[PDB]
Design a protein around this ligand. Structure first.
Ligand SMILES: [Ca+2]
Length: 263
């Protein structure tokens, strides 16, 4: 029942640490509501959407193909690689790797993709090149995660991430086909059930990507809207608390319910 902003502040009171929140209109790009919009939070696995954005950009520039098959070895596997560990013989295409990174948060998939473009620093250059001088990626998986306190490495701000996500999903930075492919992968997210999706009514569209660090942090970026069409971008970051994963998940779910009931 509580207003979104009230619920967000409540969440922070309960969890400790900091909670960052922003809602932007997809069409206009106007900020509808926010909390700690310009403060830095760790991106965690939410960066994987940006990564595949840079990938699709290379596809649009004719420097990459989603169908290009990549072979790797057991030496390349890092923690949490549910998809890539199953394809040591047949490998995976660039498209499949992006699907795995986004829909399953596969870590090796992200690392392989990062190699195709020259590493974390090259992703940062891509961000700078599209007008995002705030967001920065510094490390690989899984080090880029968890999460030492307000160390600026591998961080963004609610408003920076939201603005950058809007530029990727709308506008002419990517071709229409690539824009659709990006949101398609996000729609198929398979590991964000307990979050915003748990509070979404029937017939609503949602495309999202979550992130998490063993202890302290949690995040979700999403494009959602009623009647099977996305109309708003929501970004929620949490960090610096000693609360359990269950509590973190619950608070996000409650913030999502407030957003919907007050749409
Ligand atoms: Ca507070």
């Amino acid at each position: 029942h509580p207003e979104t902003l009230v619920k967000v502040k409540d969440a922070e009171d309960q969890l400790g640490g900091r909670v960052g929140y922003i809602e932007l209109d997809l069409a206009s790009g106007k900020i509808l509501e926010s909390f700690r919009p310009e403060e830095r939070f760790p991106m965690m696995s939410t960066f994987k959407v940006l990564l595949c954005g840079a990938v699709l950009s290379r596809v649009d520039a004719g420097q990459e193909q989603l169908g290009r098959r990549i072979h790797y070895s057991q030496n390349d596997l890092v923690e949490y690689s549910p998809v890539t560990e199953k394809h040591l013989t047949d490998g995976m295409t660039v498209g499949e790797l992006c699907s795995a990174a986004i829909t399953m948060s596969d870590n090796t998939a992200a690392n392989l993709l990062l190699t195709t473009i020259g590493g974390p620093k090259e992703l940062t250059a891509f961000l700078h090149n599209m007008g995002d001088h705030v967001t920065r990626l510094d490390r690989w998986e899984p080090e880029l995660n968890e999460a030492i306190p307000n160390d600026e490495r591998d961080t963004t701000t609610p408003v920076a991430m939201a603005t950058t996500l809007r530029k990727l999903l709308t506008g002419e930075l990517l071709t229409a086909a690539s824009r659709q492919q990006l949101i398609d992968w996000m729609e198929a997210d398979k590991v964000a059930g307990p979050l915003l999706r748990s509070a979404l009514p029937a017939g609503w569209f949602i495309a999202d990507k979550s992130g998490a660090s063993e202890r302290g942090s949690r995040g979700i970026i999403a494009a959602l809207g009623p009647d099977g069409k996305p109309s708003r971008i929501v970004v929620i970051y949490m960090t610096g608390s000693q609360a359990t994963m269950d509590e973190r998940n619950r608070q996000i779910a409650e913030i999502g319910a407030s957003l919907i009931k007050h749409w």
